[PDB]
Amino acid sequence: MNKYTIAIDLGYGQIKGINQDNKRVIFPSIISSGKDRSLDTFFNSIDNIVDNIHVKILDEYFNEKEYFVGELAKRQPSNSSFINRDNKINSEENKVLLATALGLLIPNDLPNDTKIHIVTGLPLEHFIKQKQALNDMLKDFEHTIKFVDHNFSRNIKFEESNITLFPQGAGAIFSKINNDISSLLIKETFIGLIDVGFKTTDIVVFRINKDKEPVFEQEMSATLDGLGMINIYNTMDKAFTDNSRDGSKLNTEQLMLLCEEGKIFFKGDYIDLKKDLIKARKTLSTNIINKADGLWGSRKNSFNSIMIAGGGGKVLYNHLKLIEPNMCQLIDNPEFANAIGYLEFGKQF
Amino acid sequence: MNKYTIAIDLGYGQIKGINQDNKRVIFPSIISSGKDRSLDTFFNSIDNIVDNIHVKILDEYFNEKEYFVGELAKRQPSNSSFINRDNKINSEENKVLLATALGLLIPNDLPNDTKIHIVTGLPLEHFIKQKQALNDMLKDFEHTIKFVDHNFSRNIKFEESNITLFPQGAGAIFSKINNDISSLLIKETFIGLIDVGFKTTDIVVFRINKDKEPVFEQEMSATLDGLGMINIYNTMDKAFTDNSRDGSKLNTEQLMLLCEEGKIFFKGDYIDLKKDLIKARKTLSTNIINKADGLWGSRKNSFNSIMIAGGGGKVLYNHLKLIEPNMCQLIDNPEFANAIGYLEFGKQF
Amino acid sequence: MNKYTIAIDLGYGQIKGINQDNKRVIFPSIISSGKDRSLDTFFNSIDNIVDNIHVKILDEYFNEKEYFVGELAKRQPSNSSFINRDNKINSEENKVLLATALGLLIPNDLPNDTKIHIVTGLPLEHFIKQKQALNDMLKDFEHTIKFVDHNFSRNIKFEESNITLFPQGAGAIFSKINNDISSLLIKETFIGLIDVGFKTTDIVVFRINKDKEPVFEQEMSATLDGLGMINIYNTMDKAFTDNSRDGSKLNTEQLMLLCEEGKIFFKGDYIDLKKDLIKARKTLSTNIINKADGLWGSRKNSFNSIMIAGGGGKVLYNHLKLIEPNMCQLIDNPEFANAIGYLEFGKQF
Amino acid sequence: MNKYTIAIDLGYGQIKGINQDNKRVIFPSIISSGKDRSLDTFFNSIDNIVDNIHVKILDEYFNEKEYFVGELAKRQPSNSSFINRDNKINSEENKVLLATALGLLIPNDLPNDTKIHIVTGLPLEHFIKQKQALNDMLKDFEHTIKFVDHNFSRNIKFEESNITLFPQGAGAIFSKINNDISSLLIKETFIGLIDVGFKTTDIVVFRINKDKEPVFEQEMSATLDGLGMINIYNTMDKAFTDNSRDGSKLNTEQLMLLCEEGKIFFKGDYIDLKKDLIKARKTLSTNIINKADGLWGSRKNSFNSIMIAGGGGKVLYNHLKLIEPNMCQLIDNPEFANAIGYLEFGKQF
Numbered sequence A, B, C, D: 001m002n003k004y005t006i007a008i009d010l011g012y013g014q015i016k017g018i019n020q021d022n023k024r025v026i027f028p029s030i031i032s033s034g035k036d037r038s039l040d041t042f043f044n045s046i047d048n049i050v051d052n053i054h055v056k057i058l059d060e061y062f063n064e065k066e067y068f069v070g071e072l073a074k075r076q077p078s079n080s081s082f083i084n085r086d087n088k089i090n091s092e093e094n095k096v097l098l099a100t101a102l103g104l105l106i107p108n109d110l111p112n113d114t115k116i117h118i119v120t121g122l123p124l125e126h127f128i129k130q131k132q133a134l135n136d137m138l139k140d141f142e143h144t145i146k147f148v149d150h151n152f153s154r155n156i157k158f159e160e161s162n163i164t165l166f167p168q169g170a171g172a173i174f175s176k177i178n179n180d181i182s183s184l185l186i187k188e189t190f191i192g193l194i195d196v197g198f199k200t201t202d203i204v205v206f207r208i209n210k211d212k213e214p215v216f217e218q219e220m221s222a223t224l225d226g227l228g229m230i231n232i233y234n235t236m237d238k239a240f241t242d243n244s245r246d247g248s249k250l251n252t253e254q255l256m257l258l259c260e261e262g263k264i265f266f267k268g269d270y271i272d273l274k275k276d277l278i279k280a281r282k283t284l285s286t287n288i289i290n291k292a293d294g295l296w297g298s299r300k301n302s303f304n305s306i307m308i309a310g311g312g313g314k315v316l317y318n319h320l321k322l323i324e325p326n327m328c329q330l331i332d333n334p335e336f337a338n339a340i341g342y343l344e345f346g347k348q349f
């Protein structure tokens, strides 16, 4: 039929989703208990729904749990701690976040026959490893969302021949840049996509064949498991605890505020940690270059375009240029590189 | 299980219907005899049934008749002339329109034990006049519809106590806004819907009381019978022959294409009649404003919200704004004001 | 490697085909039994195979048959009479023509693993009627062709999902001009191809929409079945016997030579029949114009570009101009309008 | 009859224009809100309507706004600030300046059944770069002007192919001197036209062939955006605060008074800035000495006669002579060179 499509991602740093109609949302993976918002309604109006997501989630048993979630929960000191957030794909923490972006990307008044061909993403070492667990949950995912301060609801339910599972970074270079660089890729060149994830960074390569079509190399491509931006939040956390000379610990919000700037305004003064920030990024820079060449022998010289993606690829790109300068480049929308890739390569159905 | 609900409208310009599950269809009120289609199927793929209603309808003899109806009938050279279309609500011209309106708005594989609360409509001055004529038709309406080139059939038959008649503009402002207009209605005010239709324009008012509940008045509210879009097509038909000066008179499509734009593509050229389109709309704007003061004395100053409706109100919303500017506003669906107004006020039972 | 593409036409006057590499062949639709040729080779050197198709064709018995086809068959006294030629698309008369059309349009030393997207054609009113007859023939067409005195052979066999049927005039104006006519089609206009062929004349229209995409109509478009060049040959055959007054009736060549010029070289003299050639063309011009008003009401004024096609349209382009002068124009290949229209609209897959 | 011809100039300094009847108007590009000049109507004679442009402008929804524009807007302190007027071609600010030029260049007793040809200009860089927007805005233009205090009006609207686009200063020497300078241009010489406008400055050249016919040279000719008379208002503005040292800034009127006079009468006394005036006048002349030679190497020696245009360079003619003295010259109407060059080369149609 005219059944719809929403491409989301389970990215532990920040959830990145897009519909079939190219409207796209982004919010961190932060949930909290939802509390009633009436006083703050009068001071500051909620124009951006994404900035202030308080929301209600009905279940199949017709109970409900309110949630400060996303940008709104990040302001809360009582949120989910998010730096030890569990990797379990069947967690209710994942259920709320998967219910969240669906509530923001289902348009108004769709026909219920026109269901949603949802497209997800799994890590490369986790795709075969954790396939049916998400297929268990998305089969069982049936709820009803209710937006606080916005007063619109969506019923949600998913079936087979609407669920569709792809690995992470699959359609990012299988399409939407493969349609463009096909004049440049000629014969048995290798394209290299490195999605710098928050927790885990994926490194995926495709070989173009005789027929200028991509074929996949699992023995040249894998996941930097635990290598990525989460170490920068981990190390720079310890870099303040000795520089403050107090044992003072920043919260979840200030740490995410830190590693975009490096200068947190602590007790009337900016504690400067620019020295360790350039150090830890170059610490992460070398940890990506060498470990990619654990999968890349002299075949690195068979590269035509080393592409990097993810939110972590943006702030590394100048230092992460040193994989192979003037051959490497950056994808256009680095965070949504999965999500735009999940859309077009999710249009196989 | 509970009984199903469909709210359609037999409006003279176009059939405007909606079901219980908030799915709506719209197509112009033109019928045509159906002819065999597999050839035009092959040239262009049919993704919309509404453009291409080739359809078979059984009767009391169980004899099928092929029909082109809706957009497909307008392109036919042999369709209904549509300017001399009958007002007899029990006519077969009204039956095939009502068959397709009930044919599209039923989903597949429903249980056959349940029945449907169908809610039709009448003109305001012709509700009492044409009450039993449609009551006789809906009791007589035993037909089985069969969509050619889509191949799904419906058995459409209704006994007593399932049909529900309302006048036009009845539940569009009594209901359908009552959850949102309740803060605007305060004490002894008049709300008013002005539906600009094909043959007629329709004026309906509702006095709200001290206890903030609307109640009807019939001497402030009537049907502008024969005054509507039909004065625009007949005037602009003469405007082409005044501008062609050849005796060439427009067909069914060319006149209907004209008053939507004003530039008929005649002999490789657009024949400009934008100014006469303004004049025919202004005389229609003359004949609704001056007739409103016939129904309204100083009580036009007793308004809190004028609403205008009809597809003819879409091109005239700023033009018919001169009744009471900065108080009149647009109904949220200009075509579907009557149908959803039939839906919410039909679910009151 | 990718699959090859050939677009031929089985037109009643002459086979008009073209391949993927834009090489075209044309020869009249006359077959003849082949006889041994080494003698006429010695008198005159053969630089054109099309004039001199002596050719052997294997079958399901793998039994070769010699054939003279094309220009070489027309000079034979014992060829097909060509006025009583069958319309049965699965006939061997159609097979040998289709064998040579596929025989010429394949270059030498192609890989045997790849297959060819062959695109044939049908009359418009006989597309649905003769759909499975050619589908049965193309599934049955297992033949090996062998060109005598040129000595290159082709193994021509096609399985399922390689043939592609289209009506005549389908892709000639839907495609083949769509990159150039897109600036001319603006809003709700009709383009029209008029192919003047041997047995029939063919009328096909396409309404463009508001979104500037053409869509087909079948009640404004049909096959002028039995009305075409065949009315000119039969009338001018009687025109010679009216002018010879001896009982001498023209043969296959003399009648075909006549209506191209009008002066058959009979007994050392040109017998003038130029005026009767004008009369037979004018009655054909009568029987396409008056039949056009049968398909077109005032919608002839809804044209932006008439196109005329067919080899019969070449001698009638200024003569059939009287439908709508200063708007009708000539297709860029009067013969090859259908074939390249099959080629571009066959490459859409 | 023949469709009426207009040629206007969209110059940001002052809007110029001339009609088919060769009557020409000029007024500054300043707008304001119109207010009821009825008190002064009793006091002083309102005869120069160009001095006194109070004007109402209807639209397609019949919602008018009053406008002081041009010379009457110069006396207003409430006018558009005009040092920061938007360079968008599709502004209402342009439309008010456009419609003012319309009703002044359409005299009474003319056939309004005949359409209106207009010939406008662009920046020479932006003639293709911002081409379609002016092509859109003129086709979108449909209003109705109302002349306050003079009580006549024009219906104002444009279809396509009545508007005509030629670049700034194109036809001023391509036409309008081509019947006179043909004796002067001999062989391989370059005529050169320099439009010293307010915001921008054009320099345009034409190679002539062997056959004494001009041809365009896009790489010896460009637009000097940010160079022109707006530098003189920019430089002398701070010179007043340099001279007065008060913190008082001149308004739009006093500043435009200053760079046409040089001696502002501030606070009961003439405050002198004549020394810095010529200093900027040499400086603007310096910036045209450079940038012309940036496109003119030794090919400047191949000239025959430079022309210069613009009201800015008109008072610069001695200092701007220094580029090529006694070969450069000034066009006779430095304001109306472009509009007559629009009109004369617009009289091809």
Ligand SMILES: Nc1ncnc2c1ncn2[C@@H]1O[C@H](COP(=O)(O)OP(=O)(O)O)[C@@H](O)[C@H]1O
Pocket: A009, A010, A011, A012, A013, A014, A015, A016, A196, A197, A198, A199, A200, A229, A259, A260, A309, A310, A311, A312, A313, A314, A315, A334, A335
């Ligand atoms: N402007 C920015 N400044 C600093 N870090 C950023 C910025 N934008 C994104 N990031 C980092 O990138 C991460 C987002 O990665 P993302 O592409 O969402 O991968 P994942 O799919 O693993 O969540 C965040 O955790 C954040 O630290």
Ligand SMILES: Nc1ncnc2c1ncn2[C@@H]1O[C@H](COP(=O)(O)OP(=O)(O)O)[C@@H](O)[C@H]1O
Pocket: B009, B010, B011, B012, B013, B014, B015, B016, B196, B197, B198, B199, B200, B229, B259, B260, B261, B309, B310, B311, B312, B313, B314, B315, B334, B335
């Ligand atoms: N986009 C449009 N442009 C011009 N006219 C329109 C448009 N949409 C609707 N109309 C006019 O409105 C009429 C539809 O009125 P409608 O609300 O269906 O009333 P009714 O119930 O009497 O049929 C049509 O006949 C048509 O002329």
Ligand SMILES: Nc1ncnc2c1ncn2[C@@H]1O[C@H](COP(=O)(O)OP(=O)(O)O)[C@@H](O)[C@H]1O
Pocket: C009, C010, C011, C012, C013, C014, C015, C016, C196, C197, C198, C199, C200, C229, C259, C260, C261, C309, C310, C311, C312, C313, C314, C315, C334, C335
């Ligand atoms: N130069 C010509 N002079 C006269 N008649 C011609 C000429 N070229 C083509 N024709 C006529 O056009 C016919 C070819 O039509 P064609 O486009 O092949 O249609 P079809 O597809 O029906 O065979 C021939 O039978 C012939 O009579």
Ligand SMILES: Nc1ncnc2c1ncn2[C@@H]1O[C@H](COP(=O)(O)OP(=O)(O)O)[C@@H](O)[C@H]1O
Pocket: D009, D010, D011, D012, D013, D014, D015, D016, D196, D197, D198, D199, D200, D229, D259, D260, D309, D310, D311, D312, D313, D315, D334, D335
């Ligand atoms: N008599 C004058 N004295 C001083 N400056 C003048 C005079 N006449 C015109 N100008 C200057 O010339 C400019 C007019 O340029 P114009 O030819 O209209 O170019 P544009 O097409 O860019 O508006 C004005 O801004 C003004 O400063």
Ligand SMILES: [Mg+2]
Pocket: A011, A168, A195, A196, A197, A198, A310, A338
């Ligand atoms: Mg990721």
Ligand SMILES: [Mg+2]
Pocket: B011, B012, B168, B195, B197, B310, B338
């Ligand atoms: Mg109605």
Ligand SMILES: [Mg+2]
Pocket: C011, C012, C168, C195, C197, C310, C338
């Ligand atoms: Mg043909």
Ligand SMILES: [Mg+2]
Pocket: D011, D168, D195, D196, D197, D198, D310, D338
């Ligand atoms: Mg200028």
